[PDB]
Amino acid sequence: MKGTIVGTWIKTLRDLYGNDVVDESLKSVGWEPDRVITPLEDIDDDEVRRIFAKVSEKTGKNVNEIWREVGRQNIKTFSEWFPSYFAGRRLVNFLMMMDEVGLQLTKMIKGATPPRLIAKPVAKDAIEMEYVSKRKMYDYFLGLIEGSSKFFKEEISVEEVERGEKDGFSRLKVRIKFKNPVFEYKKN
Ligand code: HEM
Numbered sequence: 001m002k003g004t005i006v007g008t009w010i011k012t013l014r015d016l017y018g019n020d021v022v023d024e025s026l027k028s029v030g031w032e033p034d035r036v037i038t039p040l041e042d043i044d045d046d047e048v049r050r051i052f053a054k055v056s057e058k059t060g061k062n063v064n065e066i067w068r069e070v071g072r073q074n075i076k077t078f079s080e081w082f083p084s085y086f087a088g089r090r091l092v093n094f095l096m097m098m099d100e101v102g103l104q105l106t107k108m109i110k111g112a113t114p115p116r117l118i119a120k121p122v123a124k125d126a127i128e129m130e131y132v133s134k135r136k137m138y139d140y141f142l143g144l145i146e147g148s149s150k151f152f153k154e155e156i157s158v159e160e161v162e163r164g165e166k167d168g169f170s171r172l173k174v175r176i177k178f179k180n181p182v183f184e185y186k187k188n
Pocket residue numbers: 001002003004005078082085098101102105111112113114115117133134135136137140141144145148
């Protein structure tokens with residue numbers, strides 16, 4: 001990953017799991033517990049992987065479970081660093097815009113590699129959102145969704161539809177139902 005995102009993860013882990021757990025885990029991979037990560041740095045995905053593995057060991061929580069929790073809380077962290085994205089009224093609009101934001105950053109930020117988050121309405125009160133990535137952060141993705149619902153104070157039901165790997169790409173499709181109708185058939 002790029003530096004920006006790893007910065008948020010470290011912060012979120014600490015908020016979640018305390019300072020000693022994180023300090024220790026970063027040292028285990030040879031990092032400085034209080035490393036200053038710059039946005040445009042490139043960070044070894046395997047190093048991150050080993051960090052989270054250590055957090056798993058120290059806390060006794062399954063790594064997948066940690067990512068789920070990290071995903072939920074990281075929305076709070078990210079909204080504090082980058083408030084403008086969260087400035088809108090609605091959860092649905094937030095979610096529907098995310099794919100565009102991702103495409104744009106791939107273009108703007110050298111080396112940046114965010115997943116596709118393809119969203120499309122499937123009923124008056126529902127969209128499908130498909131995560132597509134070379135990485136595979138199924139639990140993180142799901143966590144982010146819940147965190148978003150939490151931030152926007154809009155209850156949603158999330159049901160997983162498809163999960164699988166093809167051609168080196170991990171995919172996860174969910175159906176997200178909103179409380180009220182948000183879509184309308186309008187003509188082509
Ligand atoms: C709120 C504004 C957001 C911005 C500006 C943003 C942008 C980014 C960036 C820059 C990365 C890292 C790319 C890299 O380091 O190579 C990333 C990773 C990721 N983003 Fe977002 N994101 C946002 C919200 C979300 C939301 C709401 C979701 C899910 C609904 C999401 C899904 C993911 C996932 C799952 C990753 C991990 C990388 C992977 O799985 O391949 N992001 N995002």
